[PDB]
Amino acid sequence: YIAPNPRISSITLTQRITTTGPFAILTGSTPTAQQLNDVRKIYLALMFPG
Amino acid sequence: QEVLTDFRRQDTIWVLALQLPVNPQVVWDVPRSSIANLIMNIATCLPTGEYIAPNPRISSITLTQRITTTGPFAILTGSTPTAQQLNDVRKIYLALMFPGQIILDLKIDPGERMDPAVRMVAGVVGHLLFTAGGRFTNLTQNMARQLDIA
Amino acid sequence: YIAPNPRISSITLTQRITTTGPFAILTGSTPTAQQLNDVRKIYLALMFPGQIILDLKIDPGERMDPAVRMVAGVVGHLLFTAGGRFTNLTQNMARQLDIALNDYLLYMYNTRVQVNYGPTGEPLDFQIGRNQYDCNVFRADFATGTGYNG
Amino acid sequence: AMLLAPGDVIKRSSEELKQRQIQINLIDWTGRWVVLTEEIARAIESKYGTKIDVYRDEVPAQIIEVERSLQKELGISREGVAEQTERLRDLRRKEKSGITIEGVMSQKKLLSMIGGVERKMAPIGARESAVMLVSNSIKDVVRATAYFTAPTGDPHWKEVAREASKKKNILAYTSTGGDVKTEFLHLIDHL
Amino acid sequence: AMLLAPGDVIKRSSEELKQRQIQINLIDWTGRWVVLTEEIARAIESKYGTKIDVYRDEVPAQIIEVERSLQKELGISREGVAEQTERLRDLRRKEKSGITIEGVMSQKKLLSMIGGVERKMAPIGARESAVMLVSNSIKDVVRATAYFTAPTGDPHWKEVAREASKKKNILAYTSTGGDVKTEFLHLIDHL
Amino acid sequence: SSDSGPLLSVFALQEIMQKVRQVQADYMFTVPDVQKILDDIKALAAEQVYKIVKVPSISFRHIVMQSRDRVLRVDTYYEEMSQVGDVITEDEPEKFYSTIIKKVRFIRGKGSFILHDIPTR
Amino acid sequence: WATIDVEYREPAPYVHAQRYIRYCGIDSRELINPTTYGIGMTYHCYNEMLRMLVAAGKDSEAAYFRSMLPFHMVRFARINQIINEDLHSVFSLPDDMFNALLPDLIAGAHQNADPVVLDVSWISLWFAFNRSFEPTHRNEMLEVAPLIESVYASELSVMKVDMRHLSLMQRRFPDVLIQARPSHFWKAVLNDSPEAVKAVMNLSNIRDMMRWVMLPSLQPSLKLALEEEAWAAANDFEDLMLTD
Amino acid sequence: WATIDVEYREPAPYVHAQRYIRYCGIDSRGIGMTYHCYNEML
């Protein structure tokens, strides 16, 4: 799994959070390990449609 | 005259390898080349020049505000901006010289502590530097809202 | 060769430069030695009407104060003749002189007057002044020689 | 909007957190001046939000003497000036019948001496920040909606981090470079 | 509009050239007073375009004490006067706990002492002069559009004159009588 | 303080490229010098497709044998163009078509010439 | 505000760009002098803004903005001259796409090329308002642009006709010629194209490539005239000495 | 929305399953391609 922009962990948080709003709050947060499993489940459902 | 009337001589043959009245459709028919066309337009025919401050016969603007202990009494006009501000003013002028192809947008740095006065007067100058309707726009709607609020 | 006023070299420059404008800049300047040769060439063409013809020397890597071009464009119409019976200058020189005269006429250096432009893009196709004067008669036409001494 | 952070971060930023009105819940692990009369102190507290004590003949102390310039600046009534100078005369008599008084008369001197910075000129919102509580307790780990991490450590921070990462839907932020306090303040501003 | 002139002329008229904002390119051939606070210096610099230094407890120096008359003339706020007199009191205490101060209180005294002359009341154009550069270098002989000559001489002026006269279309001006500097200034005004 | 066409162009490339690099895929930079591009394009415009020669290139050459009455005539065109392009292989069509393009380019290159000032007596 | 920013006067040297831009209604047909231009002339927006500012009681700011007016007028005069006089080229955006920029932004249904957005700060607005652009002298390559444009168009046309002839040749002899996809011989053609054109065009799929190939717009040139004859002469494989 | 994602082209090695799946209508035989739902979203 790859983020749209690589090595975003190196850049400072201030450059990731730029404005206000729900999307601004969502952007810049790093996912927890457990949520990666749910991302895997979502992709698994993506490969098998029905 | 060597370019305009030299071809009428009887001792010269002009082999026209390249024809001048080129139809612009050929250049613009190549897919997804707006950026390249704009860059080449800037590169090939933009004149060179300098940035000059206004006449020093105009003093610094003084704000009619009650005095706070750390606020700026006036904002100087002869002060030299930093390199980043020079890049930003270059962006402003470049977008001004190309009406509909380049558009501005605000950006706020986490640091760079600025008094409210500079923003509060930039909101004044924005309504005069740019046009926001009629035939084209130089600024996005977010910039329009921010300038109106300021 | 004699200047209209003798011994102008003795008088101080301040008495020669009195006002502002292209003519004021032109007045008071002393010619260089090399330009005297070109003056000799112009007079030589004046003595021989149909056997000597003039043309403009343009260097691709040279420049000048536009006031001298404006003044030359104004002067050339009165100084030379073209059309009717004979000519002293090529068609290209006539076109350049017409363009220079147009640029001088649209130079609002001291006062502003109303101007109405013509449908066509040719130079001198406009009416100027409170009294509508047609400037199209000053465009060169070798068939009748309206724009010059003929 | 409840946040979990290392204890040293909140310890270092307690002043800013108090200034921005977020309540602090933290677990540890191991001369002033007075005004002549209560009216001037009340006026200055209303103007700047700074608590000021009142002189009550206690001990040899340091007295602040608000001057005509600040009297006009603060919009003080005539009676306030009259009672101030009456108390001043009383002090003159007291020290003549045998305490230091300072006649501060510039706004900047008063600010740099004691008190809080003046107010900025923006519209006043209903609340300064959208967050209510930042804590460092395992007793309210279920209370939190997001948490913040830093390379700095606490003896209880590892267990709290483990118990907070187990939440199904929680926002996680980490700081790697720059200043920890500045990043935390920017986050608390934008959250 | 670029001009070539003898080096001594530009050397003698550098002050006027700087005052009229034409940049100088030349090749050679071989106690001040301070203001109590930065606000008054900034105000006077804005009003007259004169740079003023700030007193910073350096050495026994000479201090300018702007007086009530100039305080009202310059439109100085109450806080500026208050901080000025606070610094004055500090100086009184410093020199009593054992520097010269001048209480200038007329406009003409300040002008004749230090600073630039006041501004005239004409409409302000976009630019003071139509010329940008006056130089004395052979490296930019092709840069020039006109040149000025004088009976005065430079070790490099003859070669520059020869290389400039070769231009096909160049304006030439020469001064024979009167004052060279006055003629040069009149030319630079009317050009 | 100063500005120029190429400098502002380089600045525009830097800004646009920095904006567009924010999103990329496949998890696999340089800013071209506009001076070099302009110089190359100007030189290419200054190039001449044809060429002026006094004598046409040799078309037929002869190899003398031991016989005094017989000789071989060789067409120079075919003996030399065989060196144009690399060998052909059927697995990669791209190289084959590149060789075809080079071969068709060579004919156009050879066939463009102008005779001028031929030496005669 | 109530100004005619765009107008069409006469046919231009390039038929695709007829519009004339004029900020604040200033005409670019008349030359100006920086010393005296802009004194005592205003446009609607500036006058209304000054009236509003003086009505609010801010006298100092109104006086400052009144004093700066000639500098403002001269700056937009220079900008208008630069836009109308120098930047006229084929690389300028055509009128049809220019007219649709604003409505597309209003509707948000972006289908053409999106405009470039740039970031700017608060202090930059003040610095821009307190600075002007003065052209010292014209570009070195301003005089020689049309030849470059013509050679670029000619090279594009040559590549297009080469693609067409390759497709026709591949269709002509399917028995011996190796079957290939367009991405193969297009890359083969691009391998032989001059480097300058590739560098110019690479400053920024297959469906768009086919759409571009199918377009009927061609640019006549001597190189094309020789190339078509060479392709016609290439119909004989023996002339290429490729035999089966 | 307004797009077709399942289609049949030619017989498959497995006779029981011959369908093709094309999310968003894109096929392998990524700049500029869009679909109706995303345009309506914008």
From TrEMBL, chain C:
Transmembrane segments: none annotated. Signal peptide: none annotated. This is VP3. It comes from Bluetongue virus 1 (BTV 1). It is found in: Virion. The chain holds residues 302 to 451 of 901 of the full protein.
From TrEMBL, chains D, E:
One of its GO terms (molecular function) is structural molecule activity. Residues 81-98 have a biased composition (Basic and acidic residues). InterPro entries: Orbi_VP6. It is found in: Virion. Keywords: Virion. GO terms for cellular component: viral capsid. This is VP6. It comes from Bluetongue virus (BTV). The lineage of its organism: Viruses, Riboviria, Orthornavirae, Duplornaviricota, Resentoviricetes.
From TrEMBL, chain G:
It comes from Bluetongue virus 1 (BTV 1). The gene is VP3. The lineage of its organism: Viruses, Riboviria, Orthornavirae, Duplornaviricota, Resentoviricetes. This is VP3. The chain holds residues 452 to 701 of 901 of the full protein. It is found in: Virion.
